[PDB]
UniProtKB/Swiss-Prot annotation:
It comes from the Bacteria. The chain holds residues 454 to 503 of 804 of the full protein. This is DNA gyrase subunit B. Consists of 3 domains; the ATPase domain (residues 1-220), the transducer domain (221-392) and the toprim domain (393-804). ATP-binding is cooperative, and both subunits must be wild-type at residue 103 for supercoiling to occur. Non-hydrolyzable ATP analogs (and ATP-binding) induce dimerization and enhance ATPase activity. ATP hydrolysis induces domain shifts that are probably part of the mechanism of DNA cleavage and rejoining. It comes from Escherichia coli (strain K12). Belongs to the type II topoisomerase family.
DNA sequence: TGGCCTGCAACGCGGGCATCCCGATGCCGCCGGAAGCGAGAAGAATCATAAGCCGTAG
């Protein structure tokens, strides 16, 4: 929301690897889990 | 200390009255020249959009 741009991209690895970016075709990795540290930055 | 203002008597000519000629003027017919209103075009300006640095944090 702070900077919305369809061209702005740095990694793009997550969306490229989970789906094709639209998603009903490729539904690979139906189960995802996000492990994160217990600090405030986590 | 020097010059402006004014009373006064003598010289001077202009105001007042009469009048015919002249030039402006109102009127009428006729010709012309900005105008101004709307409309189209150009330049000037203030609001709205994308960071950059400051210093820690990942």
């Amino acid at each position: 929301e702070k900077a919305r741009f369809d061209k702005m991209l740095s990694s793009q690895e997550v969306a490229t690897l989970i789906t094709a970016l639209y998603n009903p075709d490729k539904l690979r990795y139906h189960s995802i889990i996000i492990m994160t540290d217990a600090d405030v930055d986590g």
